[PDB]
mmCIF file of C-alpha atoms and ligand atoms in Angstrom:
data_model
loop_
_atom_site.group_PDB
_atom_site.id
_atom_site.type_symbol
_atom_site.label_atom_id
_atom_site.label_comp_id
_atom_site.label_asym_id
_atom_site.label_seq_id
_atom_site.Cartn_x
_atom_site.Cartn_y
_atom_site.Cartn_z
ATOM 1 C CA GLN A 1 0.000 0.000 0.000
ATOM 2 C CA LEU A 2 0.949 3.674 -0.305
ATOM 3 C CA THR A 3 3.468 5.178 2.125
ATOM 4 C CA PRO A 4 4.810 8.752 2.558
ATOM 5 C CA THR A 5 8.409 7.484 2.709
ATOM 6 C CA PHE A 6 8.365 5.635 -0.634
ATOM 7 C CA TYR A 7 11.122 7.814 -2.147
ATOM 8 C CA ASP A 8 13.117 8.651 0.990
ATOM 9 C CA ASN A 9 15.924 6.368 -0.218
ATOM 10 C CA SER A 10 15.537 6.432 -4.010
ATOM 11 C CA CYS A 11 14.799 10.155 -4.474
ATOM 12 C CA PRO A 12 14.922 11.987 -1.120
ATOM 13 C CA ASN A 13 14.899 15.366 -2.877
ATOM 14 C CA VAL A 14 11.807 14.803 -5.031
ATOM 15 C CA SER A 15 9.528 17.005 -2.907
ATOM 16 C CA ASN A 16 12.114 19.803 -2.912
ATOM 17 C CA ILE A 17 12.506 19.674 -6.692
ATOM 18 C CA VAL A 18 8.740 19.818 -7.154
ATOM 19 C CA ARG A 19 8.507 22.770 -4.770
ATOM 20 C CA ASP A 20 11.277 24.703 -6.539
ATOM 21 C CA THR A 21 9.558 24.237 -9.897
ATOM 22 C CA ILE A 22 6.261 25.580 -8.580
ATOM 23 C CA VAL A 23 7.886 28.511 -6.766
ATOM 24 C CA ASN A 24 9.610 29.571 -9.995
ATOM 25 C CA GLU A 25 6.444 29.177 -12.055
ATOM 26 C CA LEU A 26 4.325 31.126 -9.559
ATOM 27 C CA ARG A 27 6.312 34.285 -10.291
ATOM 28 C CA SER A 28 5.117 34.383 -13.896
ATOM 29 C CA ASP A 29 1.817 32.556 -13.351
ATOM 30 C CA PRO A 30 0.183 33.082 -9.903
ATOM 31 C CA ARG A 31 -2.620 30.708 -10.920
ATOM 32 C CA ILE A 32 -0.399 27.633 -11.349
ATOM 33 C CA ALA A 33 -0.808 26.239 -7.804
ATOM 34 C CA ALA A 34 -4.591 26.166 -8.183
ATOM 35 C CA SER A 35 -4.222 24.685 -11.665
ATOM 36 C CA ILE A 36 -2.025 21.856 -10.420
ATOM 37 C CA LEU A 37 -4.385 20.922 -7.603
ATOM 38 C CA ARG A 38 -7.200 20.737 -10.153
ATOM 39 C CA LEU A 39 -5.106 18.433 -12.330
ATOM 40 C CA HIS A 40 -4.583 16.008 -9.437
ATOM 41 C CA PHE A 41 -8.300 16.005 -8.619
ATOM 42 C CA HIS A 42 -9.253 15.270 -12.217
ATOM 43 C CA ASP A 43 -6.574 12.599 -12.328
ATOM 44 C CA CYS A 44 -7.874 10.816 -9.255
ATOM 45 C CA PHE A 45 -11.551 10.863 -10.284
ATOM 46 C CA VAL A 46 -10.859 8.870 -13.460
ATOM 47 C CA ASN A 47 -9.519 5.343 -12.863
ATOM 48 C CA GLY A 48 -7.684 6.615 -9.789
ATOM 49 C CA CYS A 49 -4.592 8.792 -9.477
ATOM 50 C CA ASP A 50 -2.577 7.088 -12.239
ATOM 51 C CA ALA A 51 -1.545 10.136 -14.289
ATOM 52 C CA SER A 52 -3.960 9.030 -17.013
ATOM 53 C CA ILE A 53 -4.984 12.678 -17.449
ATOM 54 C CA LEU A 54 -1.449 13.608 -18.510
ATOM 55 C CA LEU A 55 -1.481 11.339 -21.573
ATOM 56 C CA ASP A 56 -1.869 12.886 -25.020
ATOM 57 C CA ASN A 57 -3.778 11.396 -27.977
ATOM 58 C CA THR A 58 -2.791 8.142 -29.693
ATOM 59 C CA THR A 59 -4.574 6.353 -32.531
ATOM 60 C CA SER A 60 -5.828 3.745 -30.052
ATOM 61 C CA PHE A 61 -7.244 6.023 -27.324
ATOM 62 C CA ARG A 62 -8.387 9.635 -26.956
ATOM 63 C CA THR A 63 -6.898 12.012 -24.398
ATOM 64 C CA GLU A 64 -8.827 13.013 -21.270
ATOM 65 C CA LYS A 65 -7.731 16.556 -22.054
ATOM 66 C CA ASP A 66 -10.708 16.697 -24.417
ATOM 67 C CA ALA A 67 -13.214 15.765 -21.715
ATOM 68 C CA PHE A 68 -15.983 18.280 -21.034
ATOM 69 C CA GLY A 69 -14.494 18.928 -17.605
ATOM 70 C CA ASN A 70 -10.942 19.396 -18.915
ATOM 71 C CA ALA A 71 -11.123 20.957 -22.376
ATOM 72 C CA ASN A 72 -10.359 24.671 -22.359
ATOM 73 C CA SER A 73 -10.019 24.484 -18.564
ATOM 74 C CA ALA A 74 -7.326 22.058 -17.387
ATOM 75 C CA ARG A 75 -3.889 23.688 -17.549
ATOM 76 C CA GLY A 76 -0.308 23.534 -16.320
ATOM 77 C CA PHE A 77 0.714 20.467 -18.327
ATOM 78 C CA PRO A 78 4.037 22.019 -19.438
ATOM 79 C CA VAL A 79 4.864 22.806 -15.810
ATOM 80 C CA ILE A 80 4.393 19.140 -14.931
ATOM 81 C CA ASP A 81 6.691 18.231 -17.838
ATOM 82 C CA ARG A 82 9.299 20.589 -16.397
ATOM 83 C CA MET A 83 9.355 19.120 -12.894
ATOM 84 C CA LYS A 84 9.222 15.593 -14.304
ATOM 85 C CA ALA A 85 12.324 16.333 -16.387
ATOM 86 C CA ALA A 86 14.093 17.819 -13.370
ATOM 87 C CA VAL A 87 13.151 14.815 -11.240
ATOM 88 C CA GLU A 88 14.252 12.377 -13.946
ATOM 89 C CA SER A 89 17.660 14.067 -13.865
ATOM 90 C CA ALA A 90 17.892 13.816 -10.079
ATOM 91 C CA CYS A 91 16.620 10.234 -10.011
ATOM 92 C CA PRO A 92 16.264 8.402 -13.380
ATOM 93 C CA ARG A 93 13.187 6.195 -13.875
ATOM 94 C CA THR A 94 12.161 6.448 -10.220
ATOM 95 C CA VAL A 95 9.223 8.776 -9.566
ATOM 96 C CA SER A 96 5.960 7.996 -11.343
ATOM 97 C CA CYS A 97 3.993 10.791 -12.979
ATOM 98 C CA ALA A 98 1.064 9.784 -10.754
ATOM 99 C CA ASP A 99 3.123 10.370 -7.608
ATOM 100 C CA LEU A 100 4.749 13.491 -9.036
ATOM 101 C CA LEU A 101 1.346 15.083 -9.631
ATOM 102 C CA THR A 102 0.216 14.110 -6.137
ATOM 103 C CA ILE A 103 3.298 15.757 -4.599
ATOM 104 C CA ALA A 104 2.807 18.789 -6.860
ATOM 105 C CA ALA A 105 -0.776 19.130 -5.643
ATOM 106 C CA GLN A 106 0.240 19.007 -1.983
ATOM 107 C CA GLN A 107 3.149 21.416 -2.474
ATOM 108 C CA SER A 108 0.861 23.749 -4.438
ATOM 109 C CA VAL A 109 -1.582 23.808 -1.534
ATOM 110 C CA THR A 110 1.216 24.497 0.952
ATOM 111 C CA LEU A 111 2.838 27.218 -1.170
ATOM 112 C CA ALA A 112 -0.562 28.915 -1.384
ATOM 113 C CA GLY A 113 -0.641 29.063 2.416
ATOM 114 C CA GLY A 114 -2.442 25.797 3.088
ATOM 115 C CA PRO A 115 -1.492 22.868 5.361
ATOM 116 C CA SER A 116 1.792 21.008 4.961
ATOM 117 C CA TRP A 117 1.947 17.207 5.058
ATOM 118 C CA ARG A 118 3.627 14.210 3.450
ATOM 119 C CA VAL A 119 1.386 12.497 0.916
ATOM 120 C CA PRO A 120 1.264 8.690 0.662
ATOM 121 C CA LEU A 121 3.379 7.536 -2.298
ATOM 122 C CA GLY A 122 4.018 4.477 -4.446
ATOM 123 C CA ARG A 123 1.479 5.021 -7.223
ATOM 124 C CA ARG A 124 2.315 3.900 -10.741
ATOM 125 C CA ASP A 125 1.341 5.201 -14.176
ATOM 126 C CA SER A 126 -1.558 4.065 -16.341
ATOM 127 C CA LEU A 127 -1.093 2.318 -19.681
ATOM 128 C CA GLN A 128 -3.983 4.208 -21.292
ATOM 129 C CA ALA A 129 -6.203 7.304 -20.994
ATOM 130 C CA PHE A 130 -9.947 7.258 -20.285
ATOM 131 C CA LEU A 131 -11.907 9.978 -22.091
ATOM 132 C CA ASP A 132 -15.355 8.384 -21.802
ATOM 133 C CA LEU A 133 -14.801 7.586 -18.144
ATOM 134 C CA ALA A 134 -13.721 11.186 -17.540
ATOM 135 C CA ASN A 135 -16.897 12.515 -19.149
ATOM 136 C CA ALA A 136 -18.926 10.172 -16.968
ATOM 137 C CA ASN A 137 -17.030 10.647 -13.704
ATOM 138 C CA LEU A 138 -16.015 14.318 -13.512
ATOM 139 C CA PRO A 139 -18.602 16.388 -11.625
ATOM 140 C CA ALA A 140 -20.030 19.519 -13.257
ATOM 141 C CA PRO A 141 -20.739 22.982 -11.773
ATOM 142 C CA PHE A 142 -24.453 22.555 -12.473
ATOM 143 C CA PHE A 143 -24.705 19.407 -10.339
ATOM 144 C CA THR A 144 -27.230 19.371 -7.491
ATOM 145 C CA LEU A 145 -26.006 18.205 -4.070
ATOM 146 C CA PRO A 146 -27.402 14.686 -4.608
ATOM 147 C CA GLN A 147 -25.502 14.538 -7.908
ATOM 148 C CA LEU A 148 -22.320 15.809 -6.257
ATOM 149 C CA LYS A 149 -22.660 13.152 -3.570
ATOM 150 C CA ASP A 150 -23.281 10.492 -6.232
ATOM 151 C CA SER A 151 -20.201 11.564 -8.191
ATOM 152 C CA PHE A 152 -17.938 11.277 -5.148
ATOM 153 C CA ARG A 153 -19.421 7.964 -4.020
ATOM 154 C CA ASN A 154 -19.001 6.644 -7.573
ATOM 155 C CA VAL A 155 -15.216 6.912 -7.285
ATOM 156 C CA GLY A 156 -15.018 5.634 -3.714
ATOM 157 C CA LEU A 157 -15.486 8.665 -1.457
ATOM 158 C CA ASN A 158 -18.615 7.988 0.634
ATOM 159 C CA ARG A 159 -18.222 10.711 3.255
ATOM 160 C CA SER A 160 -19.902 14.076 3.024
ATOM 161 C CA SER A 161 -16.776 15.363 4.760
ATOM 162 C CA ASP A 162 -14.824 14.237 1.673
ATOM 163 C CA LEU A 163 -17.093 16.355 -0.516
ATOM 164 C CA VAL A 164 -17.245 19.433 1.707
ATOM 165 C CA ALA A 165 -13.525 19.405 2.503
ATOM 166 C CA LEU A 166 -12.259 18.767 -1.028
ATOM 167 C CA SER A 167 -14.635 21.407 -2.399
ATOM 168 C CA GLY A 168 -12.419 23.744 -0.396
ATOM 169 C CA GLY A 169 -10.071 23.524 -3.349
ATOM 170 C CA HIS A 170 -12.177 26.391 -4.644
ATOM 171 C CA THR A 171 -10.598 28.610 -2.010
ATOM 172 C CA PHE A 172 -8.411 29.803 -4.879
ATOM 173 C CA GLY A 173 -8.217 29.610 -8.665
ATOM 174 C CA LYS A 174 -10.385 30.840 -11.545
ATOM 175 C CA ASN A 175 -13.752 29.989 -13.120
ATOM 176 C CA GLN A 176 -15.138 30.985 -16.525
ATOM 177 C CA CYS A 177 -18.242 33.151 -16.838
ATOM 178 C CA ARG A 178 -19.670 30.329 -18.950
ATOM 179 C CA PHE A 179 -20.324 28.229 -15.859
ATOM 180 C CA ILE A 180 -22.430 30.759 -13.933
ATOM 181 C CA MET A 181 -24.465 32.454 -16.682
ATOM 182 C CA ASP A 182 -27.529 30.441 -15.676
ATOM 183 C CA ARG A 183 -27.226 31.461 -12.019
ATOM 184 C CA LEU A 184 -26.922 35.105 -13.029
ATOM 185 C CA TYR A 185 -29.751 35.421 -15.557
ATOM 186 C CA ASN A 186 -31.938 32.347 -15.940
ATOM 187 C CA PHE A 187 -31.556 29.555 -13.415
ATOM 188 C CA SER A 188 -33.272 26.259 -14.201
ATOM 189 C CA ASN A 189 -35.475 27.916 -16.832
ATOM 190 C CA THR A 190 -37.086 30.046 -14.123
ATOM 191 C CA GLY A 191 -36.260 33.266 -15.946
ATOM 192 C CA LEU A 192 -34.690 34.485 -12.709
ATOM 193 C CA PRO A 193 -31.232 34.402 -11.120
ATOM 194 C CA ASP A 194 -30.387 31.634 -8.636
ATOM 195 C CA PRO A 195 -32.112 32.682 -5.375
ATOM 196 C CA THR A 196 -29.263 31.148 -3.365
ATOM 197 C CA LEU A 197 -26.828 33.700 -4.782
ATOM 198 C CA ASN A 198 -26.406 36.813 -2.619
ATOM 199 C CA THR A 199 -28.070 39.696 -4.481
ATOM 200 C CA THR A 200 -25.203 42.132 -3.895
ATOM 201 C CA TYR A 201 -22.658 39.595 -5.167
ATOM 202 C CA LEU A 202 -25.106 38.887 -7.997
ATOM 203 C CA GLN A 203 -24.647 42.482 -9.164
ATOM 204 C CA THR A 204 -20.867 42.182 -9.050
ATOM 205 C CA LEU A 205 -20.873 38.938 -11.028
ATOM 206 C CA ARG A 206 -23.291 40.305 -13.638
ATOM 207 C CA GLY A 207 -20.841 43.155 -14.149
ATOM 208 C CA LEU A 208 -17.991 40.701 -14.723
ATOM 209 C CA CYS A 209 -20.143 38.356 -16.788
ATOM 210 C CA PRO A 210 -22.695 40.393 -18.755
ATOM 211 C CA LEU A 211 -25.304 38.559 -20.810
ATOM 212 C CA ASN A 212 -23.981 37.866 -24.320
ATOM 213 C CA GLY A 213 -20.481 38.772 -23.165
ATOM 214 C CA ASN A 214 -17.191 36.879 -23.204
ATOM 215 C CA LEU A 215 -18.050 33.491 -21.696
ATOM 216 C CA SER A 216 -14.355 32.670 -21.397
ATOM 217 C CA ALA A 217 -13.674 35.617 -19.079
ATOM 218 C CA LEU A 218 -12.331 34.466 -15.697
ATOM 219 C CA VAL A 219 -13.725 35.156 -12.215
ATOM 220 C CA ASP A 220 -12.211 34.293 -8.822
ATOM 221 C CA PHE A 221 -13.721 31.337 -6.960
ATOM 222 C CA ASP A 222 -13.126 33.081 -3.626
ATOM 223 C CA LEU A 223 -13.976 36.782 -3.484
ATOM 224 C CA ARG A 224 -12.261 37.110 -0.086
ATOM 225 C CA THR A 225 -8.775 35.746 -0.822
ATOM 226 C CA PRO A 226 -8.524 34.803 -4.549
ATOM 227 C CA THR A 227 -5.066 33.199 -4.407
ATOM 228 C CA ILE A 228 -4.591 32.167 -0.774
ATOM 229 C CA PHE A 229 -5.420 28.652 0.392
ATOM 230 C CA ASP A 230 -7.582 29.186 3.470
ATOM 231 C CA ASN A 231 -11.050 28.546 4.904
ATOM 232 C CA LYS A 232 -12.561 31.746 3.465
ATOM 233 C CA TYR A 233 -14.347 29.585 0.876
ATOM 234 C CA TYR A 234 -16.741 28.381 3.593
ATOM 235 C CA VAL A 235 -17.312 31.824 5.077
ATOM 236 C CA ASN A 236 -18.477 32.778 1.569
ATOM 237 C CA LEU A 237 -20.938 29.890 1.390
ATOM 238 C CA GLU A 238 -22.497 30.897 4.720
ATOM 239 C CA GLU A 239 -23.265 34.293 3.172
ATOM 240 C CA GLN A 240 -24.629 32.769 -0.051
ATOM 241 C CA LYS A 241 -21.473 33.819 -1.892
ATOM 242 C CA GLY A 242 -20.307 30.514 -3.331
ATOM 243 C CA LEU A 243 -19.412 31.179 -6.981
ATOM 244 C CA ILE A 244 -20.759 28.127 -8.801
ATOM 245 C CA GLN A 245 -23.922 26.138 -8.161
ATOM 246 C CA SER A 246 -22.008 23.145 -6.821
ATOM 247 C CA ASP A 247 -20.308 25.370 -4.226
ATOM 248 C CA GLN A 248 -23.492 26.932 -2.876
ATOM 249 C CA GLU A 249 -25.352 23.612 -2.940
ATOM 250 C CA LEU A 250 -23.192 22.443 -0.026
ATOM 251 C CA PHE A 251 -24.898 25.000 2.197
ATOM 252 C CA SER A 252 -28.250 25.696 0.528
ATOM 253 C CA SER A 253 -29.446 22.381 -0.920
ATOM 254 C CA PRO A 254 -32.618 20.864 0.559
ATOM 255 C CA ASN A 255 -30.398 17.784 0.922
ATOM 256 C CA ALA A 256 -27.741 19.694 2.896
ATOM 257 C CA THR A 257 -28.742 18.572 6.395
ATOM 258 C CA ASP A 258 -25.442 16.706 6.646
ATOM 259 C CA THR A 259 -23.206 19.190 4.815
ATOM 260 C CA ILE A 260 -24.363 22.431 6.477
ATOM 261 C CA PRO A 261 -22.722 21.561 9.822
ATOM 262 C CA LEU A 262 -19.507 20.625 7.996
ATOM 263 C CA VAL A 263 -19.482 23.925 6.104
ATOM 264 C CA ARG A 264 -19.973 25.793 9.367
ATOM 265 C CA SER A 265 -17.290 23.799 11.187
ATOM 266 C CA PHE A 266 -14.757 24.571 8.457
ATOM 267 C CA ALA A 267 -15.811 28.222 8.304
ATOM 268 C CA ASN A 268 -15.466 28.512 12.079
ATOM 269 C CA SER A 269 -11.995 26.972 12.320
ATOM 270 C CA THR A 270 -8.978 26.980 10.015
ATOM 271 C CA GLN A 271 -7.487 24.022 11.886
ATOM 272 C CA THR A 272 -10.661 21.981 11.500
ATOM 273 C CA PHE A 273 -10.693 22.697 7.763
ATOM 274 C CA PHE A 274 -6.997 22.045 7.171
ATOM 275 C CA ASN A 275 -7.254 18.791 9.143
ATOM 276 C CA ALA A 276 -10.263 17.644 7.125
ATOM 277 C CA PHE A 277 -8.666 18.731 3.848
ATOM 278 C CA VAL A 278 -5.522 16.671 4.435
ATOM 279 C CA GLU A 279 -7.614 13.683 5.473
ATOM 280 C CA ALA A 280 -9.873 14.001 2.418
ATOM 281 C CA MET A 281 -6.924 14.652 0.090
ATOM 282 C CA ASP A 282 -5.167 11.463 1.167
ATOM 283 C CA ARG A 283 -8.379 9.485 0.776
ATOM 284 C CA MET A 284 -8.825 10.843 -2.755
ATOM 285 C CA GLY A 285 -5.154 10.125 -3.352
ATOM 286 C CA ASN A 286 -5.822 6.511 -2.392
ATOM 287 C CA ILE A 287 -8.423 5.920 -5.113
ATOM 288 C CA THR A 288 -7.666 2.721 -7.064
ATOM 289 C CA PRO A 289 -3.913 3.219 -7.451
ATOM 290 C CA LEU A 290 -1.659 0.978 -9.518
ATOM 291 C CA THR A 291 1.150 -0.282 -7.275
ATOM 292 C CA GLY A 292 4.071 -2.687 -7.119
ATOM 293 C CA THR A 293 4.764 -3.849 -10.660
ATOM 294 C CA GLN A 294 1.395 -2.733 -12.046
ATOM 295 C CA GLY A 295 1.596 -0.014 -14.674
ATOM 296 C CA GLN A 296 4.856 1.839 -15.266
ATOM 297 C CA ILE A 297 7.131 4.621 -14.116
ATOM 298 C CA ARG A 298 6.420 6.789 -17.161
ATOM 299 C CA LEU A 299 9.498 8.669 -18.437
ATOM 300 C CA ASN A 300 7.521 11.256 -20.417
ATOM 301 C CA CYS A 301 4.187 11.888 -18.696
ATOM 302 C CA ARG A 302 2.533 12.463 -22.083
ATOM 303 C CA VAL A 303 3.243 9.015 -23.501
ATOM 304 C CA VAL A 304 3.274 5.409 -22.328
ATOM 305 C CA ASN A 305 6.759 3.860 -22.284
ATOM 306 C CA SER A 306 7.423 1.693 -25.339
HETATM 307 C C1 HEM B 1 -17.312 19.105 -6.031
HETATM 308 C C2 HEM B 1 -17.356 19.279 -7.471
HETATM 309 C C3 HEM B 1 -16.552 20.134 -8.226
HETATM 310 C C4 HEM B 1 -16.966 20.757 -9.357
HETATM 311 C C5 HEM B 1 -18.306 20.582 -10.065
HETATM 312 C C6 HEM B 1 -15.879 21.578 -9.822
HETATM 313 C C7 HEM B 1 -15.928 22.427 -10.919
HETATM 314 C C8 HEM B 1 -14.959 23.329 -11.346
HETATM 315 C C9 HEM B 1 -15.109 24.259 -12.444
HETATM 316 C C10 HEM B 1 -16.361 24.532 -13.271
HETATM 317 C C11 HEM B 1 -13.957 24.965 -12.505
HETATM 318 C C12 HEM B 1 -13.699 26.112 -13.478
HETATM 319 C C13 HEM B 1 -12.882 25.647 -14.664
HETATM 320 C C14 HEM B 1 -12.664 26.742 -15.687
HETATM 321 O O1 HEM B 1 -13.501 27.664 -15.758
HETATM 322 O O2 HEM B 1 -11.658 26.674 -16.426
HETATM 323 C C15 HEM B 1 -13.091 24.467 -11.447
HETATM 324 C C16 HEM B 1 -11.821 24.958 -11.127
HETATM 325 C C17 HEM B 1 -11.002 24.560 -10.077
HETATM 326 N N1 HEM B 1 -11.300 23.484 -9.235
HETATM 327 FE FE1 HEM B 1 -13.044 22.461 -9.122
HETATM 328 N N2 HEM B 1 -14.785 21.450 -8.995
HETATM 329 C C18 HEM B 1 -15.153 20.519 -8.041
HETATM 330 C C19 HEM B 1 -14.257 20.019 -7.100
HETATM 331 C C20 HEM B 1 -12.913 20.362 -6.910
HETATM 332 C C21 HEM B 1 -11.978 19.648 -6.048
HETATM 333 C C22 HEM B 1 -12.299 18.342 -5.314
HETATM 334 C C23 HEM B 1 -10.766 20.298 -6.170
HETATM 335 C C24 HEM B 1 -9.523 19.974 -5.593
HETATM 336 C C25 HEM B 1 -9.354 19.444 -4.273
HETATM 337 C C26 HEM B 1 -10.978 21.371 -7.119
HETATM 338 C C27 HEM B 1 -10.034 22.338 -7.493
HETATM 339 C C28 HEM B 1 -10.204 23.359 -8.417
HETATM 340 C C29 HEM B 1 -9.285 24.453 -8.642
HETATM 341 C C30 HEM B 1 -8.049 24.764 -7.819
HETATM 342 C C31 HEM B 1 -9.769 25.181 -9.686
HETATM 343 C C32 HEM B 1 -9.090 26.384 -10.332
HETATM 344 C C33 HEM B 1 -8.048 25.923 -11.332
HETATM 345 C C34 HEM B 1 -7.401 27.069 -12.083
HETATM 346 O O3 HEM B 1 -7.733 28.246 -11.806
HETATM 347 O O4 HEM B 1 -6.556 26.788 -12.956
HETATM 348 N N3 HEM B 1 -12.273 21.361 -7.607
HETATM 349 N N4 HEM B 1 -13.734 23.486 -10.726
HETATM 350 CA CA1 CA B 2 -6.627 9.114 -13.614
HETATM 351 CA CA1 CA B 3 -8.993 31.750 -0.322
#
């Protein structure tokens, strides 16, 4: 099974190399940490964290990069290539892309001001990509709470704490206007904005995302601290200021009897949130991994070794 010390003998400096790469990238692109965490999440929700999302097209299988939840959204692939190259130089054919991305996600969270911990390691890389599975498994911003719960349970995360804590990943990063247009102007064919969206914030968002405007324009997930990893995400939800439907559903859904207290607990205490986030992150990181001699230690994260 996975262990945090997997590379302590074979590549003791892997975490440091990953950190250095992100630190350097953050200077030119302050959004990279958020982007990397999102990559790990979308890796894990499709056949487990096996770096299948990093694979490019082949004539035998399509890339997950063209999934509805990844196309024109997922980013940072070149950055992963960079750290992988650096790590391959430090320790040839040792660290899997799956593990590398997991470490990158944790380091990204820490660099953004979040908790610091050692992630379990020992994952191996997939021998194929799963586009159809990605389209079926990746949750969408328009999901209701029951659908969000179903999506998490589908991949192995049964706990509402998993859902509420991991959703905290939206404490930083960007979101396209495209995904909230319904909430702002015509929610569920009601001809009205989403009633669970704070009316003052509604005005602000309408100004950033006017009807018939640029749907690709970006908006911050957390209006309090856009680039800092903290519990402000939950404080927002309590005030009906979650950006996308799936965020606000955690606090306002008729099915939120179990998630409301979790949202409050995380909003009330940074420690409680950070603790739950690490716990949920490691559980997500433990979703159907390839281990031992299963799969490979991919040399180029974009292609299967031949
Ligand atoms: C619970 C269901 C979730 C849904 C429906 C969802 C949906 C989305 C959507 C619509 C975007 C905007 C993409 C774009 O406009 O390009 C996004 C971005 C992001 N998500 Fe999620 N997400 C969910 C869970 C999570 C989880 C579990 C994490 C990680 C622990 C996460 C981390 C992120 C980050 C950091 C970004 C910003 C990435 C960037 O700015 O490059 N999300 N998410
Ligand atoms: Ca995967
Ligand atoms: Ca924040």
